[PDB]
Design a binder for these strands. Structure first.
Lengths: 123, 187, 258, 142
RNA sequence: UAUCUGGUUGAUCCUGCCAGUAGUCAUAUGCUUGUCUCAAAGAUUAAGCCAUGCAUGUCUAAGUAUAAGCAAUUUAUACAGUGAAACUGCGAAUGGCUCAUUAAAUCAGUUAUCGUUUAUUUGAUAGUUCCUUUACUACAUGGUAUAACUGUGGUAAUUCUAGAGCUAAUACAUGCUUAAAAUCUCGACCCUUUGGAAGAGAUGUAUUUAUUAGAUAAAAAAUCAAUGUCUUCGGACUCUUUGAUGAUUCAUAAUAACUUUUCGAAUCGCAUGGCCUUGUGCUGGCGAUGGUUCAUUCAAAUUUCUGCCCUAUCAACUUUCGAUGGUAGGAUAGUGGCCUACCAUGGUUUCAACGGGUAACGGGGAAUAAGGGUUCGAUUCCGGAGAGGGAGCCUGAGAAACGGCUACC
RNA sequence: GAUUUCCAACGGGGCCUUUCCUUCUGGCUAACCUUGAGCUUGGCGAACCAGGACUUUUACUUUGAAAAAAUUAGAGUGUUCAAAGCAGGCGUAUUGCUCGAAUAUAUUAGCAUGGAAUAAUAGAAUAGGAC
RNA sequence: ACCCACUCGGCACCUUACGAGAAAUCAAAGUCUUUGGGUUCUGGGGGGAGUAUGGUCGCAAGGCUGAAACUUAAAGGAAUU
RNA sequence: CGCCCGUCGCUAGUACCGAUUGAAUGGCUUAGUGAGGCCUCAGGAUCUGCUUAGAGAAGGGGGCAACUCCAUCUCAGAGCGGAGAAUUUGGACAAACUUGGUCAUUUAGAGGAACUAAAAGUCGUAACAAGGUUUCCGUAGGUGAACCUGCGGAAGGAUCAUU
């Protein structure tokens, strides 16, 4: 028997899946960005919460410690390379304020729309 | 067969330790050799990783040494006199380690006569000069000289007949001779 | 269990081997030889995954059986020969030898050496006394015994095996200012000098060695290897001579280069 | 006890023999071996009359291994003493220590005098009996 | 991502539980079920029972080839290529499956073998083996049986076998064969006995013993075994050799002998050169196999300290017949009551002994939480037990081996 | 001018303050009266060791060695994304070059090092107390 | 024996709440979400049930230890109309 | 014109006791019987080597009449050995069988005495007000039933007040 493979869930079910305001927020986001059933919305929320918690833990550490420093630079570099992080503002603090808006912006359909190649999110 | 495990042995606290594994090959045990006095016959026994053991039985002759003077010769076993373990080995007249046993002492007497030129209490100029040079050492203590005059000596066995396959011993002398003489005379 | 094992799964293999995690199900179990299998480097994995002159076990077996490899003198034919540390391995003609030496990351390097480097070698002794008929002999880390050594040779020294006549060309006394390769432990592949070794009367001697760039770290005496004098190493060091350069600035250096 | 030669056999140091034809003092030569690890053999062991093949000072038993201290609680059992070990067990859950004790039997040479209460130090040695595996190498009397 | 809510009530505030909620390498089931990658899968109750198939055999240039097999030699008339079967040497003690038993037991962290064994690969490592040693002696390499095969068959049947004829070993069983010196013994001989010798035997390992050593803090002065070295024997003699560990009766060496006598090449394939002299005379590599020990590795075996669920509606347990230690001996490869004969009465325990259950193999780990914490872990990695319950044993370095046997259910 | 003359905070080392803050047999003597005119042989055995006279135990804490993988966090990487995996990238590609395959986690028990802040143990009292 | 002033050790009493408590009330029920003085015992929804059984003491009635199966969504405490 | 209790009747389920020298499963061992392998005491079928040794006599070398020297198909007999099976005197491992003892889990059992479940059963009104005899807690009796009574105690009383 070979070594088992590693798999992890890419989404996180919210603690309260039965309420009004959250549902309104998600439904509006899906409608105005052209998405399928909101499994990817939950996935994006999961990854955003993960990186936000990582950034909070990094900010907890004291300044000039290489432990904190090199992970902070690596995370900032990866996030700004992805593009959800604004190039002008990168101080390990704007990551704690970034929302799912930029992550959904970086999708192929929204990029095509805002470039002007399909004229519609669904198209 | 016989096993040397500790699982069957009761624990220090006194609890009956339940069995865990069956008896293993590497921890087996064989029967006592019980080397009697009789016709020479040794059977080889295969041991873990080779190294066949010489299971002696009914030995005829063995080697005995004279640590006080330092000569070793082959003498004949006569009989066990007393065993510090217990008396039934002597009663059976069987040979074990650390057992006091009479020996022929005949080649020892021949060596003394041919090497020192004097008798132990009952021609060649090279022999005479050798004895003269080796003088001032012919004195022998009372117990050993009396035993030599009477014949058979007392020897204690050092080798293990079951493992070695042969009997090797040394003549008693001094404090151990006196102690063992007292023990055997107190009868 | 009830006898020595003859197999080893591909999870318990040493991490310094640097082998593919799945790559099937099994891993090459080294055969009995000079070095221990846990700190070994078999020719199978070395020529299949670390140097890339073959594809699979059949090919590498064919390359060893063609009398092309000349491991430590004799040609050798076993694919799972346990080639350890500080051992030269001649590869037929055109002079590639690549003596096995640990890198700074703890694994093994492929640093190429020259003809004289392959001709000579250094081995650390571990046990010395006289044997049958009173012939003194030294047992090196490789495992070879050399009869009638220099009387000045003592425990924890390093001798120079010529590999042609089987005698000691020279020896290095274990004292201060000796280059150490640190064989084993968390400091694998490090290079340092001897400054002070603790007595450690109970056992497990350790020495607080010092890297060139003022890095002081202590390693057990059983995990040291005298490779030469100060500033004058007796072996061809690979790139990154035990620098142990820190993570952030080595990343900075690699991005600057790229 | 006082007389070393009390058993049926003639116990003596193996391979140790004194010439019956000589006069030199002490007659039988007493072989002694240094214990090591900063342990000093007592003066009584040098001139003692016992044999005690299990004693490291005058026997083949080595004191290789670890050294641990203890307090003697029983001396009735012959040629040996039982020491009580006091150690604290830490429970990570409660962040408080647990009082625990262990009784390990050890072997004491006749040269050392041990009572109920004094401190002893015992080092590892080869299995002497079923349970005892340590030998007394130093005693601090109270 | 340190959070809630509905419910006793005409109505209020508390304790309190029930339910809703989310997750589960946690399962089972119902409704459906287009596509890529990936993957668990008779563990939960029965470690219950199994029809039928397969899963351990193996040949290189280099152990044995008269197959009544296949062909070819043109290098060969003793043999050469391939090659069934078989003998021989190894492997079958690896791997795979399950977690029944097991609660200081396994196991994990961490130690020791100065208390043991070890095929295998790697590196070294036998000038002595004729012992009335002038015949008792093939060392140009010697003895014997046997497998396959050819004929007789028995049985209904099985990896069933008996008689006849043969034949080979890297099959069994024997066996000698190379310079010397030094050192020990006996000892003629000369005896001028300061005293010196012809001569002979002994002189490698493996085993059994016993002894001497195996050293190794500084420094002086009168005398003795026979003057020892060499001399006015007044006496000078200083030089003196010894490895390792914290530790040794350590490694090692020398003596006196011992061995139903251990080894010290009666083996195999290629290539073809030199010395004379023209003798199949004498010297000549690559290796393979095998071999006596030591080291390394593969390891195995015990072993130091700590750590394991719930129960006192388990308070004393063990100690006849082994229990806690010693003395001496047997067996093991080794230390050890592992067993034996004697002696002493001892050993653990409210700091949870001992007994009971575990629907408990342990660990590495998994699920779930601000922190703490709770539950699970048979299962892809390590270690441990098992081949239906026991118990015994051969071979084998390594097995109480079960796809190895014997005995009872 | 990132640096020296630095003025302030911060933890460290040695010495004097009755405070040996374990010490004796030898190699060299260290801080050296060694004297050379200020490199000239010996200022005081630790400035370097061999060693030996003794070490009350601790509980605790700091650091460190050793701590097999997968698995946990997590670096790098266009497996088309991702689950992943441990590759790949760049060419003059007729010849080839080449970065990587990290870094941390390891409770408790065991081993070594600085502390006597806190919590116990014993010393000398009809003195056989120490010099 | 009385009266004035002080003090220690007790039975206690009255107005208030710096505070506690769900309230009734408490100078201790306070110094407990600003959570840690030392220490023993008892309880985890109401019934079953202080029952059965296993032990133990007692002449006896009974005393000590002490469940499980099963059932329910309310059993309760303080105050208000 | 509330709330609520107890006895009894009907229906189901749960648990306990219960005669049955209770029955089955597993663990441990009292004793007896006891297969088999192992180590030893013997055993000797059978095979087989060596030394002489008689042996009828071919043929040869000799005599050359007989007769002598040598092995050949063969069988009396005498020793010197080696392997050596069947069986088997003794010791230990002792599987397993019979008989019991002890411990852990289970369930059948006539009947007895309890608990619980319920929109609609009969009798009384015991408690919630001074519940119409003020309640509650121990102890001992009586009654179909809640309950009553004697003794002691408590207010959770219906009394914070007699200078």
């Amino acid at each position: 028997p070979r070594a088992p493979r590693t798999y992890s869930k890419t989404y996180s079910t919210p603690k309260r899946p039965y309420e009004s305001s959250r549902l309104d927020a998600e439904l509006k986001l899906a409608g105005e960005f052209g998405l399928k059933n909101k499994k990817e919305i939950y996935r994006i929320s999961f990854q955003l919460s993960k990186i936000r918690r990582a950034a909070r833990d990094l900010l907890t550490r004291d300044e000039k410690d290489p432990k904190r420093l090199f992970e902070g630079n690596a995370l900032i570099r990866r996030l700004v390379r992805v593009g959800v992080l604004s190039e002008d503002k990168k101080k390990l603090d704007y990551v704690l304020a970034l929302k799912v808006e930029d992550f959904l912006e970086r999708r192929l359909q929204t990029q095509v729309y805002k470039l002007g190649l399909a004229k519609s999110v669904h198209h | 067969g016989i096993s040397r495990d500790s699982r069957h042995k009761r624990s220090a606290t006194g609890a009956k330790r339940a069995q865990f594994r069956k008896k293993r090959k590497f921890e087996l045990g064989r029967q006592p050799a019980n080397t009697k006095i009789g016709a020479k016959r040794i059977h080889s026994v295969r041991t873990r990783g080779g190294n066949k053991k010489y299971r002696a039985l009914r030995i005829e002759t063995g080697n005995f040494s004279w640590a006080s003077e330092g000569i070793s010769k082959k003498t004949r076993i006569a009989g066990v006199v007393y065993h510090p373990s217990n008396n039934e080995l002597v009663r059976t007249n069987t040979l074990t380690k650390a057992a006091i046993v009479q020996i022929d002492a005949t080649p020892f007497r021949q060596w003394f006569e041919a090497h020192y030129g004097q008798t132990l209490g009952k021609k060649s100029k090279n022999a005479e000069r050798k004895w003269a040079a080796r003088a001032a050492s012919a004195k022998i203590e009372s117990s050993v000289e009396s035993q030599f005059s009477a014949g058979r000596l007392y020897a204690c066995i050092s080798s293990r007949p079951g493992q070695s396959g042969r009997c090797d011993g040394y003549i008693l002398e001094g404090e151990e001779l006196a102690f063992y003489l007292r023990r055997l005379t107190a009868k | 269990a009830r006898g020595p094992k003859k197999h080893l799964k591909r999870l318990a293999a040493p991490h310094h081997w640097l082998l593919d995690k799945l790559s099937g199900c099994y891993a090459p179990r080294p055969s009995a030889g000079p070095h221990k299998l846990r700190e070994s480097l078999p020719l199978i994995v070395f020529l299949r995954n670390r140097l890339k002159y073959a594809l699979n076990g059949r090919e590498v077996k064919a390359i060893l059986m063609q009398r092309h490899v000349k491991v430590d003198g004799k040609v050798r034919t076993d694919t799972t020969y346990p080639a350890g540390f500080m051992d030269v391995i001649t590869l037929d003609a055109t002079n590639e030898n690549f003596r096995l030496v640990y890198d700074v990351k703890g694994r093994f390097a492929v640093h190429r050496i020259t003809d004289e480097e392959a001709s000579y070698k250094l081995g650390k002794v571990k046990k010395v006394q006289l044997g049958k008929k009173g012939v003194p002999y030294v047992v090196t880390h490789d495992g070879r015994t050399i009869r009638y050594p220099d009387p000045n040779i003592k425990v924890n020294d390093t001798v120079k095996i010529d590999l042609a006549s089987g005698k000691i060309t020279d020896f290095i006394k274990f004292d201060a200012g000796k280059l150490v390769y640190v064989t084993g432990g968390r400091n694998l592949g490090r290079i340092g000098t001897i400054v002070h070794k603790e007595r450690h009367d109970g056992g497990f001697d350790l020495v607080h060695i010092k890297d060139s760039l003022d890095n002081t770290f202590v390693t057990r005496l059983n995990n040291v290897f005298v490779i030469g004098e100060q500033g004058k190493p007796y072996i061809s060091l690979p790139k990154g001579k035990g620098i142990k350069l820190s993570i952030a600035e080595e990343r900075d250096r690699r991005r600057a280069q790229q | 006890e006082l007389t070393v030669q009390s058993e049926r056999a003639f116990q003596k140091q193996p391979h140790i023999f004194n010439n019956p034809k000589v006069k030199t003092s002490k007659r039988t030569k007493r072989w002694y071996k240094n214990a090591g690890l900063g342990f000093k053999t007592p003066k009584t062991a040098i001139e003692g009359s016992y044999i005690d093949k299990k004693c490291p000072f005058t026997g083949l038993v080595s004191i290789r291994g670890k050294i641990l201290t203890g307090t003697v609680v029983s001396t009735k059992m012959h040629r040996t003493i039982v020491i009580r070990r006091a150690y604290l067990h830490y429970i990570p859950k409660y962040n408080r220590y647990e009082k625990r004790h262990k009784n390990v039997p050890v072997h004491v040479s006749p040269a050392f005098r041990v009572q109920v209460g004094d401190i002893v130090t015992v080092g590892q040695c080869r299995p002497i009996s079923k349970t005892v595996r340590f030998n007394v190498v130093k005693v601090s009397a109270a």
